[PDB]
Amino acid sequence: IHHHHHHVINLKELKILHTSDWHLGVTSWTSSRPVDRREELKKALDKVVEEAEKREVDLILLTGDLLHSRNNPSVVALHDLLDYLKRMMRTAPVVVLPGNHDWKGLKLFGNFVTSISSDITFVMSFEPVDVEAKRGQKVRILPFPYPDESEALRKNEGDFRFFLESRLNKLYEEALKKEDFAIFMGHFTVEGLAGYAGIEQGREIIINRALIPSVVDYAALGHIHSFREIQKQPLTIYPGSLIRIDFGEEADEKGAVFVELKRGEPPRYERIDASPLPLKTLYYKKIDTSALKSIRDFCRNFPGYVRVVYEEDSGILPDLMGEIDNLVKIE
Amino acid sequence: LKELKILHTSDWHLGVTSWTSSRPVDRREELKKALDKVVEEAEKREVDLILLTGDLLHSRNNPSVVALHDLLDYLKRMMRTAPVVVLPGNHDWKGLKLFGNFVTSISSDITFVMSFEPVDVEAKRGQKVRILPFPYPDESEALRKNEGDFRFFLESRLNKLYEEALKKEDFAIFMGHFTVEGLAGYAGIEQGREIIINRALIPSVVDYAALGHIHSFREIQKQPLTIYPGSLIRIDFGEEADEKGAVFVELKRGEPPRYERIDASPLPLKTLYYKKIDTSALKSIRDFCRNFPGYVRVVYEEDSGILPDLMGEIDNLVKIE
Ligand SMILES: N=C1NC(=O)/C(=C\c2ccc(N)cc2)S1
Numbered sequence: 001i002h003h004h005h006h007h008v009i010n011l012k013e014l015k016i017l018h019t020s021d022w023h024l025g026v027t028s029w030t031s032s033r034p035v036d037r038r039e040e041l042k043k044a045l046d047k048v049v050e051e052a053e054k055r056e057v058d059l060i061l062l063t064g065d066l067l068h069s070r071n072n073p074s075v076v077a078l079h080d081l082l083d084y085l086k087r088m089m090r091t092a093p094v095v096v097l098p099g100n101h102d103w104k105g106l107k108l109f110g111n112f113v114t115s116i117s118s119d120i121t122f123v124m125s126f127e128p129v130d131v132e133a134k135r136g137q138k139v140r141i142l143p144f145p146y147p148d149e150s151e152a153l154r155k156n157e158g159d160f161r162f163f164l165e166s167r168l169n170k171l172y173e174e175a176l177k178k179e180d181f182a183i184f185m186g187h188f189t190v191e192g193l194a195g196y197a198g199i200e201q202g203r204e205i206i207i208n209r210a211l212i213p214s215v216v217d218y219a220a221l222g223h224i225h226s227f228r229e230i231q232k233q234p235l236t237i238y239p240g241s242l243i244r245i246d247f248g249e250e251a252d253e254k255g256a257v258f259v260e261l262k263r264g265e266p267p268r269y270e271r272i273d274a275s276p277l278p279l280k281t282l283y284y285k286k287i288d289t290s291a292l293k294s295i296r297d298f299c300r301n302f303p304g305y306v307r308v309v310y311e312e313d314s315g316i317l318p319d320l321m322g323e324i325d326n327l328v329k330i331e
Numbered sequence: 332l333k334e335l336k337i338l339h340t341s342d343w344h345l346g347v348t349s350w351t352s353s354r355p356v357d358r359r360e361e362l363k364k365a366l367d368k369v370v371e372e373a374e375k376r377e378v379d380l381i382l383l384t385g386d387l388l389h390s391r392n393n394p395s396v397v398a399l400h401d402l403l404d405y406l407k408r409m410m411r412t413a414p415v416v417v418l419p420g421n422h423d424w425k426g427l428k429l430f431g432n433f434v435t436s437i438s439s440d441i442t443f444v445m446s447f448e449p450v451d452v453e454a455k456r457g458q459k460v461r462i463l464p465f466p467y468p469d470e471s472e473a474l475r476k477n478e479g480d481f482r483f484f485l486e487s488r489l490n491k492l493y494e495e496a497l498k499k500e501d502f503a504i505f506m507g508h509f510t511v512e513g514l515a516g517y518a519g520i521e522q523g524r525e526i527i528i529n530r531a532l533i534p535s536v537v538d539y540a541a542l543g544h545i546h547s548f549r550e551i552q553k554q555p556l557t558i559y560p561g562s563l564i565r566i567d568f569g570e571e572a573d574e575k576g577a578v579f580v581e582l583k584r585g586e587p588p589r590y591e592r593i594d595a596s597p598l599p600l601k602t603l604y605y606k607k608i609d610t611s612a613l614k615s616i617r618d619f620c621r622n623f624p625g626y627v628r629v630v631y632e633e634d635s636g637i638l639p640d641l642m643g644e645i646d647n648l649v650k651i652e
Pocket residue numbers: 064065066067068069070071096097098099100101
């Protein structure tokens with residue numbers, strides 16, 4: 001059959017897959033016990049792709065840091081990225097808002113790929129773009145990337161805040177010129193976060209959630225690893241990362257977000273859980289005989305990675321990382 | 332179909348700055364005009380297929396953003412006119428292979444042949460074309476120390492291409508990035524030690540052999556028709572006498588192939604020769620350069636003591652030997 005977009009008359013519905021912060025290419029705990037997260041990460045990504053196809057989404061939104069390396073991504077990481085970008089494009093048109101990009105190679109690539117394809121669009125400026133979704137829906141994207149060049153010469157703080165607000169105001173005005181659906185995409189830290197939300201840094205863009213153009217149908221955000229429903233009007237969501245990158249993301253819930261829009265009804269969304277490996281931190285004053293019993297017992301059938309935190313040395317520690325392949329950090 | 336119109340251009344060398352050690356000249360503006368003229372002629376003649384060989388980028392390992400932008404820009408312009416097939420030259424940056432594969436898979440208007448693996452493509456009017464690619468082999472220095480089996484390796488690849496060229500529908504096109512043996516006279520790369528291939532070892536069954544890496548136009552042979560289209564600008568004074576441009580190949584099933592040379596009309600180069608630089612020499616040099624719309628080289632034999640800062644007063648003069 002055909003492989004192009006459908007064109008349904010008077011269609012006022014839009015199914016959206018939104019995921020972010022893949023951190024392709026990451027290796028965790030390099031200073032204690034390096035663990036390549038690739039296999040786990042690819043599993044999570046596969047599950048997201050499968051849910052996208054199953055739910056037959058109309059549009060796929062990618063925000064946040066899809067790569068882990070800010071300047072020097074490995075070939076494997078790049079290959080994995082382009083591979084999954086391609087897998088998603090087969091499902092539905094993809095819109096990519098890159099995060100903190102350092103190397104200039106991305107901008108040329110993004111522009112060229114956008115110019116030759118109708119199933120992927122890279123938004124790398126504050127300029128709104130109109131895109132066509134899987135079933136012919138017209139969608140206006142209001143992009144808000146990490147400011148470049150001006151962010152280096154951002155001083156003073158006062159004028160930088162006014163620059164940001166001005167960009168948001170312009171985005172608001174252009175959102176009023178929407179044909180059908182309008183979606184905001186941003187890569188920054190919402191003011192007043194409380195969790196993780198911790199790291200950073202980095203040089204971060206802080207933006208009040210009330211400044212996000214209220215007249216958009218959805219506000220797709222990235223940069224933070226934890227899933228957060230920022231607000232409901234307009235619906236604003238950080239999907240979070242797909243794996244637990246470090247132990248500050250122990251209590252986090254990881255995955256993507258499925259969003260459905262109807263022009264008469266309020267927006268609804270379901271979480272798509274990636275079910276990544278769990279993390280656990282064990283706390284002790286000293287690693288005594290009781291603590292050894294506790295540590296060995298817990299790690300025994302624990303399916304994820306474990307960190308042990310203690311206060312004081314009290315003799316030669318047994319080779320715990322030797323007998324426990326699960327243990328990745330004793331500080 | 333049973334016909335096939337081809338635009339074959341090569342060796343753009345985007346990003347090149349000529350005569351760096353002497354008087355550096357950014358060839359971008361000139362090169363773009365030449366590129367613009369080639370694109371216009373591909374639109375006029377309404378070609379079915381565009382073949383790109385040779386070194387489209389001048390820098391081997393570290394191309395500038397401006398050069399990359401210009402490359403992608405012109406690839407895009409080519410794609411609007413006809414499906415594009417790119418055989419990369421001596422690639423060095425591993426990102427190129429992934430980029431090329433990705434772009435090839437997401438677009439039916441461009442194909443990057445990164446390996447020796449044959450690829451079937453469709454021209455502007457449905458013409459099924461089998462591409463037999465022969466790129467600069469990576470790890471070429473790994474088996475180069477032997478020389479013996481290195482030749483045997485290259486021959487094996489050519490044999491496979493020959494065998495694979497046999498099972499083809501409609502048209503079959505060879506694309507290679509190497510130096511044909513016996514080529515005397517530019518001969519300007521590396522050099523260095525490139526890959527040397529005997530022209531008779533080019534699969535005789537193909538309908539056309541698109542070659543790159545050579546700056547000067549060369550009709551290597553007629554059966555099969557083998558052509559280096561050459562560069563679009565005169566890179567250095569060795570190419571002073573060259574006519575620069577691309578090649579319009581018109582293939583017809585049954586009838587013998589034909590081709591026309593598409594002049595790009597880049598800036599002229601001139602070398603002035605003197606026995607020595609005397610007061611009479613300076614006058615003629617200044618007068619010629621003032622009226623010459625291109626770049627000038629001056630070579631002289633005898634030491635003429637001290638001569639005025641010609642390259643400081645003559646913007647046209649780019650090299651003195
Ligand atoms: N399409 C992409 N978007 C990004 O943000 C990417 C990578 C990236 C890598 C490291 C960072 N610190 C931020 C972003 S790749």
